[PDB]
Amino acid sequence: LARASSLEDLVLKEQWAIPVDATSPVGDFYRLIPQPAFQWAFEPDVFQKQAILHLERHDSVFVAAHTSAGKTVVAEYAIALAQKHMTRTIYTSPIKALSNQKFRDFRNTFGDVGLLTGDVQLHPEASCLIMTTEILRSMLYSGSDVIRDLEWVIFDEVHYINDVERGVVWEEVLIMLPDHVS
Amino acid sequence: DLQAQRHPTTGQILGYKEVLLENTNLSATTSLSLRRPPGPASQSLWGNPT
Amino acid sequence: TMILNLLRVDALRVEDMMKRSFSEFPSRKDSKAHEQALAELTKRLGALEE
Amino acid sequence: SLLLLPEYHQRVEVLRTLGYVDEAGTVKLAGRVACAMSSHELLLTELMFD
Amino acid sequence: LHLKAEALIKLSDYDSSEEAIRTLDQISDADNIPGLLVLKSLAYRNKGSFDEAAKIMEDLLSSYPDLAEVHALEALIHFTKKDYLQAEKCFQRALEKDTEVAEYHYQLGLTYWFMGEETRKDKTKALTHFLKAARLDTYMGKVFCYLGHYYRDVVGDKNRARGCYRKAFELDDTDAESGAAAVDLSVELEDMEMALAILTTVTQKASAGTAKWAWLRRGLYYLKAGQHSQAVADLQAALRADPKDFNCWESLGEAYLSRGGYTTALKSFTKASELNPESIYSVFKV
Numbered sequence: 001l002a003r004a005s006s007l008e009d010l011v012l013k014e015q016w017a018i019p020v021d022a023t024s025p026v027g028d029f030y031r032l033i034p035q036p037a038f039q040w041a042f043e044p045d046v047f048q049k050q051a052i053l054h055l056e057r058h059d060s061v062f063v064a065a066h067t068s069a070g071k072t073v074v075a076e077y078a079i080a081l082a083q084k085h086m087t088r089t090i091y092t093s094p095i096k097a098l099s100n101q102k103f104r105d106f107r108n109t110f111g112d113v114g115l116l117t118g119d120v121q122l123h124p125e126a127s128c129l130i131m132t133t134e135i136l137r138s139m140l141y142s143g144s145d146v147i148r149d150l151e152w153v154i155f156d157e158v159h160y161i162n163d164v165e166r167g168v169v170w171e172e173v174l175i176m177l178p179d180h181v182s
Numbered sequence: 183d184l185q186a187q188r189h190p191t192t193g194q195i196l197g198y199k200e201v202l203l204e205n206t207n208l209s210a211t212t213s214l215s216l217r218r219p220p221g222p223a224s225q226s227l228w229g230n231p232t
Numbered sequence: 233t234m235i236l237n238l239l240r241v242d243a244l245r246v247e248d249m250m251k252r253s254f255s256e257f258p259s260r261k262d263s264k265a266h267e268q269a270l271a272e273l274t275k276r277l278g279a280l281e282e
Numbered sequence: 283s284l285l286l287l288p289e290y291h292q293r294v295e296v297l298r299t300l301g302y303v304d305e306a307g308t309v310k311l312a313g314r315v316a317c318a319m320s321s322h323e324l325l326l327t328e329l330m331f332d
Numbered sequence: 333l334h335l336k337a338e339a340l341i342k343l344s345d346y347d348s349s350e351e352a353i354r355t356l357d358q359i360s361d362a363d364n365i366p367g368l369l370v371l372k373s374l375a376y377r378n379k380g381s382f383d384e385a386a387k388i389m390e391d392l393l394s395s396y397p398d399l400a401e402v403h404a405l406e407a408l409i410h411f412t413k414k415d416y417l418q419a420e421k422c423f424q425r426a427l428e429k430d431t432e433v434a435e436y437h438y439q440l441g442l443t444y445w446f447m448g449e450e451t452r453k454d455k456t457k458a459l460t461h462f463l464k465a466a467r468l469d470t471y472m473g474k475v476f477c478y479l480g481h482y483y484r485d486v487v488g489d490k491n492r493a494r495g496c497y498r499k500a501f502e503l504d505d506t507d508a509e510s511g512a513a514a515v516d517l518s519v520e521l522e523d524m525e526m527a528l529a530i531l532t533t534v535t536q537k538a539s540a541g542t543a544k545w546a547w548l549r550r551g552l553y554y555l556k557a558g559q560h561s562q563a564v565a566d567l568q569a570a571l572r573a574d575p576k577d578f579n580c581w582e583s584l585g586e587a588y589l590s591r592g593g594y595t596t597a598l599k600s601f602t603k604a605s606e607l608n609p610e611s612i613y614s615v616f617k618v
Contacts, residue, residue, distance in 0.1 A: 005492065007468050012495045034540045085568055086599040124227060139228035141237045145221055148592035175252050191516050195613060216592035231314045235293055236317045240309050250284050259283060
C-alpha cells in the first residue's frame, strides 16, 4: 500500500525513616483496596487504616499505640495477607505465658496456627508459627529451612529491649534476618 | 535437567531441551545463599550445628 | 554462644555484628559521609610541593 | 573504635584456654557441643566431658 | 428538545443487554414523538439482547422504515445478515455503498462489511478498501479505532499493524485487546524498552485490579531477567485482579521456585492444578 500508509501515518503522528502523620492523610480507604483480606466486626480507625494501607504494598510499619486490642488488628491483617499469598508468617512474643491465649485466638479466628516452645511443637507445618524470640534466635543461626518462606515477622512487644537480661536477643534477631523478610 | 521450552508469545511448552545446571557443588553445610540444596531430609527445626 | 555460632561460620566475623549493634548507632550513623570525606581528602593531601 | 573489642578478645582467650577453640579461631568438638546448648553452656559441657 | 433525545438514543444504542434494552424502551417512551425514522435505531438497541426483543425490534423496524430509512434500512438489513449467514451482506453492501456516498457513514457499512468479510473472504476491495475509507474517515470518538484494530488482525504489514494497535488502545482505553496485541507484537519485534513504557503507563492508571493483562506481562518481563522480587510483587497484584486464571498461578509458582521457596511453590502449583486439571505440567512440577 502507498496511500493508506500515509493516511495511517499522518493520524498516528536519604531519609530511611518516614514519619507518616497519624491523623490527617487518609480519606479514601475503599476506593483503592476494595477487597480487604480481612473483615472485622467494627470500623477500623484512622491509624489502623494507614497501617493497612502500608501493609498492602509490602512496607515495614512501626505501629506505636496504647491499647493492646488496637495493635492486633494490624497483627492479624498481616496474617490474612500471609494466608492469601500462600506464604508463611512468624509471630513472636516475649512472654511464655502470653503466647498461649494468642495461639487459641488465632486458631479460632482463622485456619492453621502452629505453636512452638521449648517442648511443645503443635503443628510445625502451619502458616502462623507462634514463637518465643529465644527460639527464633536459635533457628536463625542454622538454616532451619523455614526462613526460605517468610513474609512478615511480627515483633509483638518491642519495648522489652530496655530489659537488661533479654535485650540482646532482639538485637541478635534483628540483624540476622535475611533481606526478603519484612 | 531437561528444562522446558516456552513460545515467546502466549507461552506454551513446545518441547523439552536439556541444559546444564549451574549451582551444583554447593551444599547446605558449606555455603550460605538461597541456592543450596534444601537439607538432609525432614529434620529437627533448630538445634543443628554444622 | 554468640561467639561460637559466629566463629563456626567462615564468611561472618564477630566484629560485623558489633558494628551493626544499636549501642554503636551514634558512632556509626554517618559512616558513608566519613568514608567519602576520607576518599575526597586523600586527593587534597597530594597537592603541596616538595 | 568498637567499645567491646577487648572483651571479645578476652572471651576468645578464655575459650581457648579450655579446649574449645584451636589457634586462629577454628571450633573444636567441645565447641560444637557447647554451641547448641540452652543455658550454662560452659559448665554443662565441662561437666559432660569430665 | 433535541440534544437530550439524541443523547438518550446514543446511550440506548451503546448500552448493555436486555435490561438496558428496557432502558432504551424507557428512553424511547420519554422521546415518543414525531420523526419516527429514529424508531428503527431503537430496534438495533433491542438487538443488543436478541431474545424476544428482536421480534419486537422487527415490528418496530417494519413500522418505522416506511419512506426511505436510507441509513436505517441498510443498517437493519446488515443486522439481519449478521443474524443469518453472510449471504444477505453481499447484496446489502453494494446498494448501501452506492446509495450513501460518504466516508464516515460509509465507515459504518465498512465495519459491517468487514465483519461479514473477516470470516472467509479475502476482500482486497470490498472490506479492505472499505476499511481504507474508514481509515481516511478516522473519527474523533470511538467510531474508527475499532476499524483500524479489526483491519490489522493477524497479517498485512505487521509494522503499521503495531501502529494502529497502539493508536486504537491509546485513544480508547477501557478495552484490553488493542494494547495487549500492540505489546505482544512489539515483543515479537526486536525493540523491548518501548513495550515496558506502555506497560508502566497502563499499570499507573490501574485503580483496583481489573488490569491483569498488564501486570502479568510486566511480571513475566521481570522474571525472564533475574529480578525475582519485582516479578513476585507484580504477579501477586495480577492474581488479586482475578483469582482464577491458572496462567497467573503457574507463573507465580515458577517465580517462587526460582528463588529459595519450596513449599510455597508447591502450594501455588497445587492450587494451579486444582483448577484446569488438564495441564500436565502443573502436576509434574508438583
